[PDB]
């Protein structure tokens, strides 16, 4: 609470500090107050309010190159999870999407386990202002190309780094290099295909507690995400690449008799995906 | 009670949580509180209220694409039923509409049973904010056409799925495909004609308990519903159609010597009707 | 013409009419003018402005049931067509989508003719605020029923009634009754499949002038349209339906070995599609 | 052409078209005109101006989702080249940077040729508002992630695709996959190192006329580019990668006894570079 | 409060003084108030406002050579320190830069103590409008030379005069005369190299409390500063100079086998550096 | 040459090029022309002038970071010399200053020559906008640091590099390292003292032709200069320094019994001097 003290003292208005103390006014609060709000807390003289507002202008706009405003706007950022009520139709739509896309993989449940259904424990909306703005800026950019069409999908993602994704967003710097199309972030339209990646590549060693890849006790987590595909490149065979092909925004792997059994979607830029829903579940 | 905790924590205002605990302030409640409400519960410092209100703004307006307001506003919705007092004039009006509209149909009371009057047990006003707003939106849309006239009537509907209707509204995706005019929602001005369909088409198998189409014991339910007709297409013979004819908003089938014995009304959009009254009765 | 005169005379402000005559102030303009606008045109006396504003309020709100505002606000509505520059990236993306989706159809070019590419003459954007707001209202509804996802695609439509569509919107009361999936509105992802229907079902009799289905002279017109699919019902075999399946917002017919050659999409609500681009072209 | 005509006709103001014909007002000029400009061109009635302004607002903001403003505002975008005065200090400093960074390469000038200095013919500034805004947006992001420090450098780039870069910008979808640090975009702080690549990898086959990698006749083109490196990852030995290492924005390869003779810089996002100067020259 | 009294009395408007007394209006506030502001505080008559504003113009522009405006604008100038939150990425980037640039110095920690890591207590952003404007003016001047490139770096600085620097900026009149490149201001890209100078040349006599050059208790301060290097002159050997070499803006000392072990940067004009971050730490 | 063509072509206004070709409108002229000027040369349509002015705005301010305005505005810069009439009082006062400050030096005319007076051939006023602006900016800064008094003087400077000075300004990077007070720029108030330096330190070897330090035939040049001294440090005895003493702006060496015969003035910043008069003369 010292930056506000220095600011007010430099303005010559130290005798107002008691007011600022009782109202818990910090510098980041003060830089957002006008004549009306300053009058609300008892700064009655016009000269005082005018001096305060001019000081704020000199700090924020006069030294924009130092970005003091970004230094003052740290509070309130971060991710919050909002629980979806099981009786609401949004929860039910998400659960139906999870349940109705389960398939029987070529492996007998080795990577993901042996099951037919899920037991869903909760679903949470992920809210992060900065990540959402990054996503919408990129989505506008993609739709500006591609005749005003973002080509947005909602797709599943399984990863042992879900917490990192939800707090920091998707990142192609952490791409899946071993993927069929190479060095990309991978999403599936089938929930079981993404459940194959909950505990690592090929299932890893299973759950941390029992080291079982078909554990029916430990809570697993999946992501249901908004993915911007734009103009998507259709591919049937493996093709290692570092970025999207020229003139495209993503890659789509289609199932084939001698190739993929289920569809696959790859983006090479983290900002083209946003993790809307976090799903906690057990396999049954 | 965790989303509120995460929000307050990200704002750096954890020391206030005890207050939010005693007043049962959830996130859905907090997003609706201004300076006055926060001051009521004991948030006395202006700075704390300012931070909370700005955080709510960043969450609700800032991430409007994710629609957090809808996820928080699931509570309180849903249908409720209000009992009409038998001594009220509204109850007597509905009862008179029920009784005066009984007719002797061509069948010897096979479908609806053999009766001349009803014994009314209770009449319930159905209240559902979402369904009502959907219906009024459609009604304004229709009256905007058809020279500022909704052409609104109150008609009878009978169906074994009354509960689904009163909780989720009328749905043209559950239309009576086999009806004379084809794949729509059917209403009758005569309550007996609707009572013929309480247990299903042609009376079905009757009451579930006794499998009797003329049972005088089991309770029956009808719906007295607001229906928007707009510009109604007048018809006499059968005409299998999937939607309203061009330039109309419903079909009215009039009695004919070689056709209908009683009037019929068909709508082809589920939001062009609303179930205002649920009537519980027995045939006598 | 005389509305403004009557309104002004009823207020005893007839002497002002000369001003209203010079500034071409009609009643529909006047209902949108506050103190600042009225001061701009020279109503200098606060009392006259006060009387005018109160009278407008009593007309627009006091008699809202009559909807005088809708009567006054008819001017301006309607469709405009904004040409795309061939040098711009939007034009090139729309053209690339049109060209790359040509396919050889099972019939030897009987319906749409014999061609491998198009000569694109014009691409226009269709702007109509009322239709746009109808479509966006429906899109919000569907998305709220489908976990915040509209499932929006850009698809082709061909029809001999393109002009009526671009001015009146898509209407399910003019649905393709004889289609494979029932009475709805049909879209293709392949421009040639839609091109098969520009002159009518099966190509009709060809162009109006030469009565040739494979004419290389007459200008054709296709619609490139936003289509909200929401939760789509996947189908492989024909089945006729009047409306969407319960709990679904559209039908999609996927290619099958013994079934469809190319994908089809069907909506059953006119307001679930918006024609965003009108394309004028010839087959080569 | 006809867009302004349709727009004005829809508002019932066709009698103004003659004015709009003589002042060459198109819809894209009109949407930027207020009361003052409309007065300047002779629209003297306030009511007419009010109608035009409201129609524009209804098109632009009312139908934002269609992005008509983007459709209208295409004209004027694109690249322009501003020739630098050889007597000005900017030209001299760029030429000095070009000449003084020449070095003797390990090969006997096989890729680039045999020379000790250049004959500078032209130096041009590249101006493209869209590419510039893309670059500055990315720069703000990166510096926000690197304690308010973009870490901007001026580096040379040689490529056979200089024209595509100056008109479309740098694109990681056209990365040098064969480089020692993976699929990135490569820059050098020595003009001769980039001179080695103007005719292709290894100099290609030399100039298109004489097919001579050491031609002293044909004009060559090099780019001098602003590169945002952010937190750069230091590397002394080759290692192929698709994107930047975690927590980093670029890779810098440093000279080593058994490794690089000269420094290299690799970025993995096309928007992290802007081509500021286009240098035309010959080797002597 | 007397200058405003004299001003208003000379204008003949002494009867207004009461208002000015209650609103705490001083001459420094008044010189910035136009008609709207004077009306806000209750100067209702246009003539009084007109006289006030003309008097202010006669003072500010009419006697510019006396610079009364500067005499009135002293308040609000000065430095403020804004504390970075340890949970923010800015703080973490600065700390990572501090920790990762630690090296083992030729002296066994004689000057800077013995340690591998720091304990970072706090990091503050330094904000001074006037010093910032001096820096940005010099930066634009340098970049106007050096082909529109400031060549800006972020470098550490240690000094027993950090307070004087943050309140008055970098000053070449306090240059390090005995440095290897002579009478300049010295910065290091390695934190520990600058830590060696925190208590003076060669560490001085250690911390004042214990006179211990390797104290682990006392708090040390470093600066992380923006430095404009422009066209830097590369050097390897000691070279005493008073100013930059001709055509250059700074000197870069590069490591050599027989020379420096770590890089060094020297400016000869105090306005080419700005002290952005103040870091308080202990050696561990 | 082609910049204006590109700019106009990108706007779709190529048909106007003939006007621009006949009126010799280049891009640097065009960016300074508003509606009135464009009307003067015959751009009659308001729409065309509008497009031109908006394109200029997008270039100049939309891409301010590229500084295109500096690239365009190079022409017209440079020094001009304005001859003073030998009959004007300005010429006469400058000549009187030259003649009346001649002194007999301790050396026998070795460095400068043997003479009592000069023969003045020309006096020229040096006009260079950029150098003058740099001077006045520094002068403002100094006077703000010296109670509003810049302490400006008019003093003589002799140099073999007069041409470079009048075209580039004074430069501390070319300081007289061997001077009595260190690495600064030295000015005399006695013309003969500065005459001692027109052919180098200690007179060098004399004139280029006769290699004579007392040549009465060759044309020598002195500068009469406005020097900002600010707060000057008084010194009686030699002491070398690289910059001004702390809290000062210059050094003044007063004559002493064992020190200087004549006064000296030293600045350590090139921008604190401006060369006003170029004097051509011979000794007699
Ligand atoms: O949901 C998915 N996740 C991954 C995946 C995630 C994380 C990781 C890593 F361990 F972090 F490197 C590896 C692979 N791969 C795929 C899918 C679904 S589409 C098929 C591929
Ligand atoms: O009230 C009515 N209900 C039905 C009716 C209700 C339910 C069903 C279904 F079994 F659920 F599909 C079928 C028909 N049909 C009619 C009327 C009165 S007007 C004449 C026709
Ligand atoms: O683009 C299409 N148009 C029509 C179509 C349009 C109008 C009419 C009618 F003349 F009004 F009856 C009939 C059919 N059908 C289809 C497609 C492409 S998806 C396959 C079906
Ligand atoms: O300036 C440079 N350009 C390229 C370069 C440019 C274009 C291409 C391609 F033909 F398009 F694939 C390949 C390489 N590589 C390097 C440098 C300077 S640092 C060393 C590497
Ligand atoms: O950060 C640095 N500071 C100083 C430094 C600071 C203050 C003083 C003085 F005592 F005030 F004169 C002397 C030297 N020198 C160096 C560096 C880092 S690069 C190596 C040299
Ligand atoms: O006018 C003066 N010029 C110089 C002078 C000018 C240029 C040079 C050099 F060629 F660059 F090295 C050296 C010395 N020194 C002094 C004075 C008059 S006051 C006494 C000293
Ligand atoms: Zn387990
Ligand atoms: Zn029964
Ligand atoms: Zn034809
Ligand atoms: Zn050649
Ligand atoms: Zn200590
Ligand atoms: Zn001579």
- What DSSP assignment string belongs to A125-137? EEE-HHHHHHHHH
* Chain centre to alpha carbon of residue F200: 20
Residue A200 CB partners (closer than 8 Å, separation 6+): A160
Q: What are phi and psi of C82, to 5 degrees?
A: -105, 120
Structure tokens at C239: 């089945």
Using alpha carbons only, give the angle B44, B47, B52 rounded to the nearest 5 degrees. 90
Q: How far is Cα D187 from Cα F244, in angstroms, rounded to an integer? A: 42
Pairing of β C264-267 and β C250-253: antiparallel
| Binary contact (E29, A50; C-beta < 8 A) | yes
Strand partners, B157: B223
Is residue D178 within 8 angstroms of chain A, CB to CB?
Answer: no
Chain E residues in contact with D152 by the CB 8 A cut-off are 149, 152
For residues C182-202, one letter each, b for 16 or more C-beta atoms within 10 angstroms of the residue's C-beta and e for the rest, the string is bbbbbbbbbbbbbbbbbbbee
Q: Which two tokens stand for residue E36?
A: 């709207």
Task: State which ligand 3 atom lies nearest to the alpha carbon of C179.
Answer: 21
Ligand 5, from E107, E112, E156, E158: best to mutate by most atoms within 8 Å of Cβ? E158
* Residue located nearest, by CA, to atom 12 of ligand 2: B176
Return the half-sphere exposure (C-beta side, CA atoms, 13 A cut-off) of residue E208.
3
Listed residues: CB within 5 A of ion ligand 7: A 207, 209-210, 215, 217-218
Among F93, F98, F11, which residue's Cα sits nearest to residue F49?
F11
Both tokens assigned to B25: 């302030």
For E65-198, list the strands marked E by DSSP. 80-83, 118-127, 152-157, 185-187
Positive or negative torsion for Cα A283, B2, B5, B11: positive
> What's the DSSP call for residue F32?
T
Q: Do D251 and D181 form a contact (C-beta atoms < 8 A)? A: yes
Instruction: Choose the closest CB to B243 out of C172, C244, C245.
Output: C172
* Local structure of A9: helix, strand or coil: helix
Cα F99 to its chain centre, rounded Å, is 23
> E-assigned strands of F24-102?
80-83
Dihedral sign (CA F212, F217, F220, F224): positive
| Nearest CA-CA distance, residue D161 and chain C, Å | 20
Subunits with 3+ C-beta pairs closer than 8 A to F: D, E
Q: First-to-last CA distance in chain A? A: 53
- What per-residue string of b and e applies to B172-192 under the rule 16 or more CB within 10 Å gives b? bebbbeebbbbbbbbbbbbbb
- For residue E13, the 8-state DSSP code is -
Q: Is B205 on the interface with A (CB under 8 A)?
A: no
Whether F225 lines ligand 6, by a CB cut-off of 6 Å, is no
Please return the burial class of C88, using the count of CB atoms within 10 Å of its CB with bins 0-12, 13-18 and 19+: middle
For residue F217, report the distance from its CA to the centre of ligand 12, in Å: 5
Output the CA E273–ligand 5 centroid distance in Å. 14
To the nearest whole Å, the CA of A269 is away from the closest chain C CA by 21
E164 touches chain F (CB under 8 A): no
Q: How far is the CA of A194 from the centre of ligand 1 (A)?
A: 7
Reading the block at residue B40, the tokens are 């009521």
Enumerate long-range contacts of A33-40, CB under 8 Å, 24 or more apart.
A33/B50, A37/B46, A37/B50, A40/B46
Question: Is residue D124 left, alpha or beta, with left meaning phi > 0 and alpha meaning psi from -120 to 50?
Answer: beta
Q: Which residues pair with E267 in a beta bridge?
A: E185
D127 annotated to bind ligand: no
Ligand 2: which residues within 6 Å by Cβ? B 157-160, 176, 179, 186-188, 193-194, 197, 200-201, 264
**Measured distance CA(C163)–CA(C161) in Å, rounded:** 6
Helix, strand, or coil here: D78? coil
Cβ contact E196:E105 at 8 Å: yes
- Does the beta-carbon distance from A80 to B7 stay under 8 Å? yes
Task: Kindly identify which residue of chain A lies nearest to residue B26, measuring between CA atoms.
Answer: A82
**H or E element that contains D97:** helix D89-100
Residue with token string 């109503």: C43
Using the mean position of ligand 10's atoms as its centre, give its distance from the Cα of residue E208 in Å: 72
- CB of E173 within 8 Å of a chain F CB? The answer is yes
Distance CA D34, CA D48 (A): 12
**Chain-chain contact of A276 with C154 (C-beta, under 8 angstroms):** no
Buried b (16+ CB within 10 A) or exposed e, F239-252: eebbbbbeebbbbb
Residue D174 in contact with partner chain A when CB distance is under 8 A: yes
Q: Are E124 and E278 in contact (CB under 8 A)?
A: yes
Q: How far, CA to CA in Å, does A123 sit from each of A126, A144, A222, A279?
A: 10, 33, 10, 5
> Which residue among A107, A156, A163, A176 is best mutated to probe the pocket of ligand 1, counting the most ligand atoms within 8 A of its Cβ?
A176
Rounded CA gap, B93 and C245, in Å? 38
Does A27 contact E at CB distance below 8 Å? yes
Instruction: Enumerate the β-bridge partners of residue C125.
Output: C82, C277
Q: How many whole angstroms separate alpha carbon F242 and alpha carbon E177?
A: 8
Beta strands per DSSP E along chain C: 80-83, 118-127, 152-157, 185-188, 220-228, 232-235, 250-253, 264-267, 273-283
Distance CA D48, CA D35 (A): 10
Short-list C252, C262, C197, C201, CA closest to C223: C197
Ligand 3, atom 10: nearest CA belongs to which residue?
Answer: C200
- Which residue, among D68, D58, D77, has the nearest Cα to D28 in the 3D structure? D68
Q: Given the DSSP bridges, would you call strands F250-253 and F232-235 parallel, antiparallel or unpaired?
A: parallel
Q: How far apart are CA A24 and CA A3, in angstroms?
A: 13
Q: Could you give the angle at which helices A3-10 and A46-60 cross, rounded to 10 degrees? A: 120
Neighbour count for residue B132 (Cβ, 10 Å): 15
Elucidated via: cryo-EM
**C-beta atoms of D149 and E94 within 8 A:** no
What's the distance, CA D156 to chain centroid?
14
- What percent of chain A is helix, strand and coil (3-state, nearest 5)? 35, 20, 45
Tell me the CA–centroid distance for residue C179 and ligand 3, in Å: 8
Is residue C265 within 8 Å of residue C194, measured between CB atoms? no
Q: Which ligand has its closest atom nearest to the C-alpha of D198?
A: 4
- Tokens found for residue C42: 């020279």
Is B271 within 8 Å of B88 (Cβ atoms)? Answer: no
Closest residue by Cα to residue C276 from C100, C142, C154: C154
10 Å CB burial of residue C38 (0-12, 13-18, 19+) is: buried
Contact present, A50 and E29 (Cβ < 8 Å):
yes
Q: What is the DSSP string of F128-197?
A: -HHHHHHHHHHHHHHHHTTTT---EEEEEEE-TTHHHHHHH---GGG-BTTSTTBSBEEEBSSHHHHHTT
Which residue is associated with the tokens 């109309």? B248
Determine if residue C207 is labeled as part of a ligand binding site. Answer: yes
Determine the distance separating the centroid of ligand 8 and the alpha carbon of B218, expressed in angstroms.
4
Nearest ligand to the C-alpha atom of residue A194: 1
Shortest Cα–Cα distance, E149 to chain F (Å) = 10
Selection from F278, F160, F156 nearest residue F208 by Cα:
F160
Q: F129: number of CA atoms within 13 Å, CB side?
A: 6
Provide the 3-class DSSP secondary structure of residue D242: coil
Residue F47's nearest CA partner among B122, B119, B117, D22 is: D22
Instruction: Retrieve residue B87's tokens.
Output: 């001594």
CA of F109 to the centre of ligand 12 (A): 15
- Around B3, how many Cα atoms within 13 Å sit in the side-chain half-sphere? 24
Chain D residue closest to A243 (CA)? D173
- Enumerate the β-bridge partners of residue D224: D156, D277
Instruction: Mark residue A169 as left, alpha or beta (left: phi above 0; alpha: psi -120 to 50; beta: remaining).
Output: left
Give kind and range of the element (H or E) at residue B233: strand B232-235
- Name the β-bridge partners of E276: none
F108 sits in which H/E element: none
DSSP annotation of D254 reads P
C215: tokens are 């004419």
By DSSP bridging, strand D220-228 and strand F118-127 are unpaired
Please give the annotated binding residues of E for Zn(2+), written as ranges: 207, 210, 215, 218
Q: What is the rounded CA–CA span in Å between residue B150 and residue E35?
A: 55
Best CA proximity match to C111, nearest among C186, C192, C222: C192
Instruction: Give yes or no for a contact between B182 and B268, defined as CB atoms under 8 angstroms apart.
Output: no
Could you tell which of C103, C165, C186, C193 is best to mutate to test the pocket of ligand 3, judged by most ligand atoms within 8 Å of the CB?
C186
């Amino acid at each position: 609470d010292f930056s506000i003290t220095q600011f007010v003292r430099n303005l010559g208005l130290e005798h107002l500090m008691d007011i600022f103390e009782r109202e818990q006014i910090t510098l980041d609060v003060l830089v957002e107050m006008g004549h009306k709000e300053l009058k609300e807390i008892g700064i009655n003289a016009y000269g005082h309010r005018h001096k305060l507002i001019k000081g704020v202008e000199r700090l924020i706009s006069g030294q924009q190159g130092l970005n003091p405003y970004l230094t003052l706007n740290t509070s309130g950022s971060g991710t919050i999870l909002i629980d979806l009520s099981p009786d609401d139709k949004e929860f039910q739509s998400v659960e139906e999407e999870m349940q109705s896309t389960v398939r029987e993989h070529r492996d007998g449940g080795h990577a993901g386990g042996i099951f037919n259904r899920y037991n869903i424990l909760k679903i949470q909306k992920v809210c992060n202002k900065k990540l959402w703005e990054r996503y919408t800026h990129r989505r506008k950019e993609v739709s500006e190309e591609n005749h005003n069409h973002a080509n947005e999908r909602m797709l599943f993602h399984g990863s042992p780094f879900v917490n990192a994704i939800i707090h920091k967003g998707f990142d192609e710097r952490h791409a899946y290099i071993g993927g069929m199309f190479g060095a990309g972030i991978y999403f599936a339209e089938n929930s079981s295909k993404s459940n194959q990646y909950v505990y690592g590549i090929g299932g890893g060693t299973g759950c941390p507690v029992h080291k079982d890849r078909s554990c029916y006790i430990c809570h697993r987590q999946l992501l249901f995400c908004r993915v911007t595909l734009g103009k998507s490149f259709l591919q049937f065979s493996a093709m290692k690449m570092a970025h999207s092909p020229p003139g495209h925004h993503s890659v789509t792997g289609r199932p084939s008799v001698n190739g993929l059994a289920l569809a696959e979607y790859v983006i090479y830029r983290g900002e083209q995906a946003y993790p809307e829903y976090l799903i906690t579940y057990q396999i049954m």
